[PDB]
């Protein structure tokens, strides 16, 4: 009767029913893609019933097939997600540091600066958003037919 145990009428055995019956990388990849919410399958239950999951998860992490949230205490995969984008690492660190150095101009002035550069500004300055009796014996018989 318990939901965590699966019965086998073929042999008459009781086997543990894991939350996600996955034992191969191919099955895991399709399982994540089938998720309807953005919640990541916890490695705690995925590791249970799977002799090796970090090795498989790490293999997929290198290939950018899935998204993995890493622990802060010790390196260990937490809830994972399907990678709907491209490669996870496709930019050199020498440019990431330069990305941090870049400081964006004032919001109200960005379109003007971009327009001065000649690039099409996909936005506008918010300052331009223009926010736009006689015969009283028939007290209630008369219906207001004001227009036609």
């Amino acid at each position: 009767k318990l939901d965590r145990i699966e019965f086998d009428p073929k042999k008459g055995t009781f086997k543990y029913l894991s939350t996600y019956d996955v034992h191969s990388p191919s099955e895991l990849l399709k399982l994540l893609r089938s998720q309807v919410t953005f919640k990541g399958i916890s490695c705690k239950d995925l590791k249970d019933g799977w002799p090796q999951c970090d090795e498989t998860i790490n293999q997929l992490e290198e290939d950018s097939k899935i998204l993995v949230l890493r622990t802060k205490k010790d390196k260990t995969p937490r809830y994972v997600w399907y990678n709907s984008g491209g490669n996870l690492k496709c930019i050199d660190e020498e440019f990431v540091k330069m990305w941090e150095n870049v400081q964006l101009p004032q919001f109200a002035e960005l379109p003007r600066k971009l327009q001065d550069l000649g690039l099409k500004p996909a936005s506008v300055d918010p300052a331009t958003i223009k926010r736009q009796i006689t015969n009283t014996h028939m007290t209630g018989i008369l219906k207001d037919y004001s227009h036609r």
Partner: protein, 312 residues
């Protein structure tokens, strides 16, 4: 979803996955996968902490990759709370990436130009940089070495002489690596994108949880003259098949209507006749068919919850 929307979504995904760490992809991808997402719901989806969600939201807010929306939500059976919702404003996000992409390339271009300029000189003691033009006015009387002004010590040539090729190599890598972004922007420029708002973005919402404490609804205050910085953005067909009986039936209906129409126009009775003499006004075949049917049968054989509502 329009084809251009996919391009913008791809552009945002590439930028975050490349120019941001790992956790940043998780936060932004959730906002893209869903519509406006409450902070509490966002926390449950990613199972990240406040001290971990803070830096991610804060950095993704400074770069304008994710917008914020604050409103007063009034749950009916509990104390209310001011809710925070995170979404993406494509026109603003596209501009932020466009400027940053240009800025990064410009810095390398300036550095490439700067490196092509003569090296210069440096002083080991005071660590003061002197250009070639400036150094020429500080050399000793012997005309043998450049002497510092503050230290009066021989100058040492500056570095970056051999980097002339390195800076060019770095620039080449940048354009090749950022190539997907530039191609995406070109397609983005071709089409026109409508600015997103908390209400507009809410139209594509996919609820995160079965019972979310955050009420994903917009309830603007009536007659609210307030304007906040950057919170404003730009029958039934019935058919009837008529059979032979219906056709004759319909004909009689018009005939009755025609008679009524004629009566509506017909003059009154008193106008019809001159009323002078009258007193002044003051206060069986079936059996035959059956036998015939049987007879031919032989011949053929022979020959052969109370709320206001309306009705829509």
């Amino acid at each position: 979803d329009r084809p251009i929307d996919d391009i913008v979504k791809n552009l945002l995904k590439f930028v975050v996955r490349g120019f941001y760490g790992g956790s940043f992809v998780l936060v932004l991808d959730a906002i893209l996968f869903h519509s406006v997402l409450a902070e509490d719901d966002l926390k449950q989806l990613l199972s990240i902490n406040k001290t971990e969600l803070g830096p991610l939201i804060a950095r993704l807010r400074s770069d304008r990759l994710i917008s914020i929306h604050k409103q007063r939500e009034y749950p009916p059976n509990s104390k209310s709370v001011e809710r925070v919702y995170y979404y993406v404003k494509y026109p603003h996000a596209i501009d932020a990436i466009k400027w940053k992409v240009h800025q990064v390339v410009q810095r390398l271009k300036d550095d490439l130009d700067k490196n092509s300029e003569p090296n210069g000189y440096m002083c080991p003691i005071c660590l003061t940089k002197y250009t070639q033009l400036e150094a020429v006015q500080l050399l000793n009387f012997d005309r043998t070495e450049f002497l510092c002004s503050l230290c009066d010590e021989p100058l040492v040539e500056d570095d970056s002489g051999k980097k002339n090729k390195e800076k060019q190599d770095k620039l080449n890598r940048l354009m090749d690596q950022i190539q997907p972004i530039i191609d995406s922007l070109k397609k983005i420029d071709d089409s026109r994108i409508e600015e997103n708002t908390f209400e507009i973005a809410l139209a594509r919402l996919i609820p995160p949880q079965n019972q979310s404490h955050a009420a994903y609804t917009y309830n603007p205050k009536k007659g609210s003259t307030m304007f906040r910085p950057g919170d404003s953005a730009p029958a039934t067909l019935h058919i009837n098949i008529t059979t032979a009986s219906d056709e004759v039936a319909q004909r009689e209906l018009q005939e009755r209507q025609a008679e009524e129409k004629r009566k509506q126009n017909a003059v009154p009775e008193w106008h019809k006749q001159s009323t002078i003499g009258k007193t002044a006004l003051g206060r069986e075949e079936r059996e035959n068919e059956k036998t015939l049917n049987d007879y031919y049968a032989a011949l053929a054989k022979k020959q052969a919850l109370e709320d206001e509502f309306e009705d829509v």
